[PDB]
């Protein structure tokens, strides 16, 4: 089990925006700007969304978005395309020198 | 006022700086031997860092 | 262009230990960390460690520690995950993933920054 809590599903339609509550605490995520997160496709490889907080890698593009807030940062999609309706997991530095993930969070786009 | 005992071999940290034009010192210049002091008057910021 | 390769899908029995090989393909081996990731199959994903080439040093995740220890052969351009002890709780997809940067300053070992993915083996065990 992940030490980050994360929801497990949002649903909706296309053209939406999205939060979606990546959770730590101060050895985690409040101390260190390392935060990231991961699309996962149903049988994919993952794909790099976000990294560092937010800096968008070539290839994503401006419908996806995040921020830091305290002990929680979270993924904010815009502009939704079904296909996009894939999973999505936070991914985080937790000290020593340890990297977690979290969550199941499957998008849903009808 | 404000003597710092900090010690470094060739170049000097976190000490005063001068009034004016970067001022040389020294005891002689006959005897080359004598440690030449300068004194700034700008400072030059050094960062060191164990990653470790 | 780059690319990251690994050896297809796998079948053992449980206990066996299991030697997971990791290609690394068009890029200097040398330059960039290395990660490894478990995938129980249709779930989450679940973090192992990682490996520095030009060092040799590893450290896995203090839930394996005494358990799975990477290594690898540069002339052959090869990573390997070696776990021992295999439970069938370690059903999983396997994966290898391109880190941060190396350096001699600075340090991107703990950075999550996995840039590509290696294609995987699924381990059949039960
Ligand atoms: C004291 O002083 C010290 C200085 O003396 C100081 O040290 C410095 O510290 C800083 C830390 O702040 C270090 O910064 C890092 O530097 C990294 C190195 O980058 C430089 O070099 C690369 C080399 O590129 C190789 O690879 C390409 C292929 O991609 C090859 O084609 C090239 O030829 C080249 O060579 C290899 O391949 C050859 C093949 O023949 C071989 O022959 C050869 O031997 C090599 O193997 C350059 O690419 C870099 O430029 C690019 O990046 C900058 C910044 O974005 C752009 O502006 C520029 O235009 C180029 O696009 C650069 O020249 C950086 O990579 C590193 O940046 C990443 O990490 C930081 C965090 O550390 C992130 O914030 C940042 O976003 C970067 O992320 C990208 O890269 C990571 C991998 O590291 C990816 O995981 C990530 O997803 C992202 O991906 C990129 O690529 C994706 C596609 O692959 C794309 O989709 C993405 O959108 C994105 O573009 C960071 O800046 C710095 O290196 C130290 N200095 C030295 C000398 O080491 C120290 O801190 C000081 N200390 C104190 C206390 O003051
Ligand atoms: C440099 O090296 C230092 C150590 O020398 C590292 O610091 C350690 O960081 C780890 C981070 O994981 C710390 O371990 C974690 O401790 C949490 C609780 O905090 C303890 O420590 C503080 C500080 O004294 C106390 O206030 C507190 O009461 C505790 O004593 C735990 O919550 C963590 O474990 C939980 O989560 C993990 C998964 O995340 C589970 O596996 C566990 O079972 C458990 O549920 C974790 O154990 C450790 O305490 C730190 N040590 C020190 C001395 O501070 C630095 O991170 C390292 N890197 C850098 C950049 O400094």
């Known amino acids: 089990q992940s030490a980050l809590t994360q929801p497990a599903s949002v649903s909706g339609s296309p053209g939406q925006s999205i939060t979606i509550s990546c959770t730590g605490t101060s050895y985690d995520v409040g101390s260190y700007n390392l935060v990231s997160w991961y699309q996962q496709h149903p049988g994919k490889a993952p794909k790099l969304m976000i990294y560092?907080?937010?800096k968008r890698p070539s290839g994503v593009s401006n419908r996806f978005s995040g921020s830091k807030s305290g002990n929680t940062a979270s993924l904010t999609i815009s502009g939704l395309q079904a296909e996009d309706e894939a999973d999505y997991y936070c991914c985080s530095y937790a000290g020593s020198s340890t990297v977690v993930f979290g969550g199941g969070t499957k998008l849903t786009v009808l | 006022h404000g003597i710092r005992p900090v010690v470094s071999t060739q170049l000097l940290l976190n000490g005063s700086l001068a009034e004016k034009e970067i001022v040389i010192r020294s005891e002689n210049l006959t005897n080359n031997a004598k440690i030449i002091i300068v004194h700034l008057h700008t400072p030059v910021e050094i960062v060191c860092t164990r990653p470790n | 262009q780059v690319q990251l390769v690994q050896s297809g899908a796998e079948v053992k029995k449980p206990g066996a230990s299991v030697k997971v090989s990791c290609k690394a393909s068009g890029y200097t081996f040398t330059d960039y960390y290395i990660h490894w990731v478990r995938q129980a199959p249709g779930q989450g994903l679940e973090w192992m460690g990682w490996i520095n080439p030009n060092t040799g040093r590893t450290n896995s995740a203090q839930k394996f520690q005494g358990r799975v220890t990477m290594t690898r052969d540069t002339s052959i351009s090869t990573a390997y995950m070696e776990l021992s002890r295999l439970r069938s709780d370690d059903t999983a997809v396997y994966y290898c993933?391109?880190?941060?940067?190396?350096?001699?300053?600075?340090?991107?070992?703990?950075?999550?920054?996995?840039?590509?993915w290696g294609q995987g083996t699924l381990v059949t065990v039960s």
């Open positions: 993933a391109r880190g941060g940067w190396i350096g001699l300053y600075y340090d991107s070992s703990g950075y999550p920054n996995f840039d590509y």
């Open positions: 560092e907080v937010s």
